[PDB]
Nucleic acid binder design. Structure first.
Ligand SMILES: [K+]
Ligand SMILES: [K+]
Ligand SMILES: [K+]
Ligand SMILES: [K+]
Ligand SMILES: [K+]
Ligand SMILES: [K+]
Ligand SMILES: [Mg+2]
Ligand SMILES: [Mg+2]
Ligand SMILES: [Mg+2]
Ligand SMILES: [Mg+2]
Lengths: 238, 51, 62, 126, 208, 142
RNA sequence: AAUUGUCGGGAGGGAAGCGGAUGGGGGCCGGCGAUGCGCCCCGGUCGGAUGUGGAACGGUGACGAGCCGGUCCGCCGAUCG
RNA sequence: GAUUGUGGUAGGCAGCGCGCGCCUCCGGCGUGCUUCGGCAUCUGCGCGCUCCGGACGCUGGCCUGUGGGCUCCCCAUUCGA
RNA sequence: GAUGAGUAGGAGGGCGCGGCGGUCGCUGCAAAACCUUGGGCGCGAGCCUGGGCGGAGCGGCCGUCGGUGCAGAUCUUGGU
């Protein structure tokens, strides 16, 4: 019939080559995905065992200290969860700057923070505007699973797949949601990268309300360090 | 010299589903959750049977 | 409320197309838009950016 | 003709944005004018006052400018202009211009019937 | 062919056994042994070539949009545990509102097949939506009632005059139902009387 | 188009005698093109009958279900009188569709508008049938 | 247009008018809201090859050759649409 | 219990069943590691299923009617002013 | 993907009036103007249209121009 023009022939040939290379890339990706699934399964199992062993070890240490008759001082918290509780109206310059540096720009925004002398002194200045404490494993897992959003190219992407995490934290060995949770909870070597990757959590208004945000938690208010009691607030806020 | 043409870049954003409610999303994000749930259920059943 | 400057929007202005109505310049702009998109070449990107510039920003060379 | 549009038409507001005090002063017309007075309660958006229009009321782009019958309007002045809608009869409807005579309106109506083009005002001057 | 499920479900979507136990039970080791240490490879099923559809008589000027695939398939309507064969039901809507009837079975469509019996309260063999029904604690034996040949197609409209065949079927079905009802004293009056709310009667407190 | 069609489009997209615009330059703006060699009467570089060397033209002939299918000759661009290769088809719609496909797509003339040409042919055929036999159905059921 | 008379409708315990939500009444609207589609049987009209000739012509090529191709008209078969 | 379905060329991703072995079929039979419970250790193909890349399905009423709709008009009412 | 307050003030994109160079049209089978609890489009400036009246002209589009947009000024003239 009609002779096929050389331009059409060239376009078809190049399309065939592109399809072939795409198919090869897809096959390689499938294989690597299989291996990655196996690896993340094993890693999650190991992390769960590690958490259980840590809890058991803490209980055993406390009991053995009691038996010996001395005191066991628990390791100081290495991680804090901070929630902004005041609005953005009528802000002092230093307080506003510190809240920006902590990435708390909206009421009921939450963020993790590694415990350091510098960070603790920064938080001491904004204590009246936030409430913070020591998050639970359940709190961290639920926060990352339900409201965890990653930052990719300064965009906020929901963590619906492990590929989103791998794209940003693959260089550091974090390729799964469980890896991210373990890094956050243990404050690992790449905690800064993981935490910065995590977009500030946008929490809803507390389910049961607040007591009084104009007073410190010690006086019966909400501001300040409520230590282990931040977890129930997280339950109500998530 | 042009790079290969792309036709699958304009994908609709995947709807976010909470892994704490539906199982398939939880398994996709963390396959070990299946084993955790199975072991927990079996242990609870064993405890109830013993009691 | 959210503590952002201008709602997080940009306040810098840069040329995104030629202000001229020269059809030949428009065709060149289309050509180099395609080249930039489908090659990712720094030279092509620079050429495309300079094609938008005003007269005083395209001085002659002796 | 079966309209191509499938999404339901949603209007954020169906009331007109009437100029403040046009009810009070006859000389003040109804066509919207944004108050610029320093003390204007309407400008300040005091609750219970006249509402001001804003881009937030914008119609959904998919259903924008669509008539209730599901088509879009196009004014036609003659049967020659009518033929432009031959390949768009599922998205566009023809409205005959107000100044067309009855004699030309009959020809336009006949041609539109031939072309399966909806006329919004086919009963005018009959 | 295996006659029993290999992996019973502890809950929806989770099996009782793990991957290793599933391997052992399925016997992939046995298949590898029999085939020589390698799984048998099966060729992909050949697709059926599309039929030679005749050319269209018309060509649309617009490309109609094909809807995206929906992977959810409806499941059969659930029957409330409070409703069992022979249970007495109270109709809350329709021309028979307040009537007490006997439940026979649930049809394929999910509607409930009920009878008055017709003689007792004038309610014939009818379909009632479960959402407009109250299930009471009163049960009557219905083992002697045969409604196998009656199904959702019995009530289908052929589109004013009731065929005598339907009347005969109603009489045959209701004979055994009335005979069973007679065993329980006062059940005749209970079925013949409608349900109503009197002064200071609270539905949220009535047990039924 | 004695000069490149891209240049012709760059010139004529702003204004031409065949351009029909209505309802201003806001969101309400409606645009169409009147040139006979525009299959969809759309003001775009793809369908433009002025900015393309190869153009398809489908309309109804004067009488007897005759459909005029014309193609712009690639070499006679400077000869308006002999610029169109015309063919008047009087046969069945199947034969007309086959001829349109052969003359538009099978020869790589303008494969990108094969669907548009077929739709235009179908519309013209339906219009001719209705003009002959009067309206017989409202075509409102979906 | 301001303003006024008449008829008809309506409202009125020391203003009237106005924003938002329904309702009563009135007024208006038939693109206000469809009746087609597919598969068969009967009857009526119009055309029916990859064959053979004529008229004009096109895609590509190089507004050359070669190759390929559509429209219309005349016939032998085909007996379909 | 309540609000809601935004999109419209994908059988994708994740998890899991049946066949490719047998027996006496609420189950049992092989190789390794075990905390002796168990284990992503063997986990390959074909056909399928699901909480799995954003709603689908059935039935009824009505279609010139005292019907349906209304951004139009006059009023009443609750809140605002 | 993120985001949305705005006086003084700045800027962008649009609506409307009257001419000129072009282009496409309408009109005694009824143009402009005006009237109307007719209808519709646009967030809006505005626009399209039914009906009436009127009885001779008018509009769309692309450029371009200007004595080009009123609620106020104890504003002007006229009318009430
Ligand atoms: K007024
Ligand atoms: K504004
Ligand atoms: K629901
Ligand atoms: K003009
Ligand atoms: K009007
Ligand atoms: K002008
Ligand atoms: Mg927020
Ligand atoms: Mg204070
Ligand atoms: Mg007056
Ligand atoms: Mg002047």
């Amino acid at each position: 019939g009609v002779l096929v023009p050389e331009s059409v022939l060239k376009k078809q040939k190049r399309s065939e080559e592109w399809a072939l290379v795409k198919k090869q890339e897809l096959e390689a990706a499938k294989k690597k995905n299989t291996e990655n699934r196996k690896l993340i399964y094993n890693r999650a199992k190991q992390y769960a065992k590690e958490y259980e062993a840590q809890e058991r070890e803490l209980i055993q240490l406390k009991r053995e200290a009691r038996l010996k008759g001395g005191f066991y001082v628990d390791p100081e918290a290495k991680l804090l969860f901070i929630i902004r509780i005041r609005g953005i109206n009528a802000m002092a310059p230093q307080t506003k700057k510190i809240l920006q540096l902590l990435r708390l720009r909206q009421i009921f925004n939450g963020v993790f923070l590694k415990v350091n002398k510098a960070t603790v002194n920064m938080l001491h200045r904004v204590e009246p505007y936030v409430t913070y404490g020591y998050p639970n494993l359940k709190s961290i897992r639920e926060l990352i699973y339900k409201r965890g959003y990653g930052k990719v190219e300064k965009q906020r992407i929901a963590l619906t797949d492990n590929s989103v995490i791998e794209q940003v934290l693959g260089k550091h060995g974090i390729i799964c949601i469980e890896d991210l949770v373990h890094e956050i909870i243990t404050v690992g070597p790449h905690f800064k990268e993981a935490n910065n990757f995590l977009w500030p959590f946008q929490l809803k208004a507390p389910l049961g309300g607040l007591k009084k945000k104009r007073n410190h938690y010690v006086e019966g208010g909400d501001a300040g360090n409520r230590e282990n009691y931040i977890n129930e607030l997280i339950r109500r806020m998530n | 010299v042009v790079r290969p043409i792309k036709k699958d870049v304009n994908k609709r954003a995947t709807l976010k589903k909470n892994p704490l409610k539906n199982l398939n999303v939880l398994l996709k994000l963390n396959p070990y959750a299946k084993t955790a749930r199975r072991m927990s259920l079996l242990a609870e059943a064993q405890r109830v049977k013993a009691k | 409320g959210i503590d952002l400057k201008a709602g997080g929007k940009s306040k810098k202005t840069k040329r995104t197309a030629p202000k001229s109505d020269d059809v030949y310049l428009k065709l060149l702009v289309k050509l180099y838009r395609f080249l930039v998109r489908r090659t990712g070449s720094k030279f092509n990107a620079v050429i495309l950016k300079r094609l938008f510039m005003s007269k005083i920003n395209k001085p002659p060379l002796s | 003709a079966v309209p191509l549009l499938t999404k339901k038409v949603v209007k954020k507001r169906v009331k007109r944005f009437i100029r403040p005090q046009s009810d009070r002063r006859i000389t003040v017309k109804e066509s919207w004018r944004r108050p610029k007075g320093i003390d204007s309660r309407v400008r300040r958006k005091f609750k219970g006052c006249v509402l001001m229009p804003n881009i937030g009321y914008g119609s959904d782009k998919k259903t924008r400018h669509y008539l209730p019958n599901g088509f879009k309007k196009f004014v036609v002045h003659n049967a020659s202009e009518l033929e432009v809608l031959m390949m768009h009869n599922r998205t566009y409807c023809a409205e005959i211009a107000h100044n067309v005579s009855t004699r030309k309106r009959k020809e336009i109506v006949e041609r539109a019937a031939q072309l399966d083009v909806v006329i919004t005002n086919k009963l005018a001057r009959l | 062919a295996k006659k029993s499920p290999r992996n019973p479900e502890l809950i929806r979507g989770v099996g009782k056994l793990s991957r290793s136990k599933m391997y052992h039970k399925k016997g992939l080791w046995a298949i590898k042994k029999k085939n020589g240490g390698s799984f048998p490879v099966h060729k992909k099923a050949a697709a059926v070539a599309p039929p030679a559809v005749k050319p269209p008589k018309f060509y649309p000027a617009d490309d109609v949009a094909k809807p995206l695939v929906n992977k959810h398939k409806p499941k059969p309507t659930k029957l409330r545990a409070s409703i069992t064969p022979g249970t007495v039901l109270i109709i809350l809507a329709g021309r028979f509102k307040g009537k007490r009837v006997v439940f026979l079975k649930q049809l394929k469509s999910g509607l409930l097949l009920v009878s008055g019996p017709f003689k007792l309260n004038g309610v014939p063999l009818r379909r009632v939506n479960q959402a407009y029904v109250i299930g009471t604690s009163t049960k009557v034996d219905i083992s002697g009632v045969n409604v196998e040949k009656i199904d959702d197609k019995y009530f289908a409209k052929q589109a004013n005059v009731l065929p005598q065949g339907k009347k005969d079927d109603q009489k045959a079905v209701d004979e055994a139902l009335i005979k069973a009802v007679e065993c329980v004293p006062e059940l005749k009056a209970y079925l013949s009387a409608r349900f109503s709310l009197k002064s200071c009667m609270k539905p949220h407190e009535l047990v039924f | 188009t004695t000069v490149p069609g891209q240049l012709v489009w760059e010139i004529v997209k702003k204004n031409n005698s065949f351009l029909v615009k209505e309802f201003g330059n806001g969101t309400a703006g409606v645009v169409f093109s009147k040139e006979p060699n525009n299959l969809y009467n759309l003001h775009s570089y793809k369908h433009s009958g002025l900015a393309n060397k190869k153009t398809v033209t489908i309309q109804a002939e004067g009488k007897d279900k005759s459909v005029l299918l014309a193609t712009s000759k690639t070499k006679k661009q400077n000869k308006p009188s002999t610029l169109l290769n015309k063919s008047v088809m009087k046969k069945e719609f199947r034969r007309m569709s086959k001829a349109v496909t052969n003359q538009v797509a099978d020869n790589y003339y303008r494969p990108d508008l094969k669907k548009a040409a077929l739709a235009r042919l179908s519309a013209v055929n339906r219009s001719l049938k209705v003009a002959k036999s009067g309206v017989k159905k409202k075509n409102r059921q979906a």
